[PDB]
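## retry 2 of 3
previous attempt timed out at serialization; input unchanged, resubmitting
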Amino acid sequence: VYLKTNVFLGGSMIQKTPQIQVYSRHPPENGKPNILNCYVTQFHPPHIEIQMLKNGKKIPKVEMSDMSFSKDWSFYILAHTEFTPTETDTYACRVKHASMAEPKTVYWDRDMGGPHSLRYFVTAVSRPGLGEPRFIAVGYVDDTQFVRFDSDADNPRFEPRAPWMEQEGPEYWEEQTQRAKSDEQWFRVSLRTAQRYYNQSKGGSHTFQRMFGCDVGSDWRLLRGYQQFAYDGRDYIALNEDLKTWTAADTAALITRRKWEAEYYRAYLEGECVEWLRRYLELGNETLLRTDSPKAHVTYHPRSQVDVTLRCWALGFYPADITLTWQLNGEDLTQDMELVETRPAGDGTFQKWAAVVVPLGKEQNYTCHVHHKGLPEPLTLRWA
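## retry succeeded, writing output
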């Protein structure tokens, strides 16, 4: 359940270049239909334009995930589209973002080369000249989105984004919608305050983020409870682990702290939040409690006459947490490892790979190990 920020606040824009991965949902086979994914992460500010192209031209029908961010505050988005690979057609994803001179085009390269949490990620973005600020809020149980709110839909309200949430009745949706609609006003005020404060121009769009929720262990004790904010991508104020005090970042916030300094947030983070997490887990037990172990395998990409790339894959796994490792003789190689960030397949499962460059004719000495929760014990594989 949504938590209300019980008090208002009183009262340097960085830019982060997006990384992009372009990949199909299932292994490609010519002539067989598939989903092509364009996964864009690690970027700030959140305004971004994302195209997918077949043979140079824009594909019109492309789904976009609700936008969210990770704990370092940077944003991600997953775009995908229906397609059927052939041997000849090319596919790329083109990204346009404030942090880059030109748009950036990444081609689909057909070879590429427990505890629980309940978390909300909230974002408000002022569009001065293009109306009131756009408010968005997305909830997560572990690695699974389950609710979303968007000021941009007409008569917006909290909505289930996991089918198992359809069980909850109108009481729930009303109360959640009401808390979202209240937080949005807060963000309006807060966006106005921050602006005024730094003497900023009424033109510039600005960004305010909030993250809040629950980390629980095996023993169901609160490992970590969160209530923190970023302004323009940068830390601003955070409830401490003590659930009593605040860490402010700059000076503009150090007066919001003195007008903020407990039981209120502790009540939520130790009480309601852990309670509803437990509830969400039952409602979606058949899937949230599942454990899809990963389909690992090693592929081989020989460039030069001396050395080649070996890539350890891991496909179709849940939950998202995982460890891939390359080894030569029990020795570890995580040093000269290229290792993409973990990515959604779109079906609720995840993908990842690790790569190393090795001396041609010696691909047999290297060994990959896949450590996933859904694994009896670490997995062992290599090339033959």
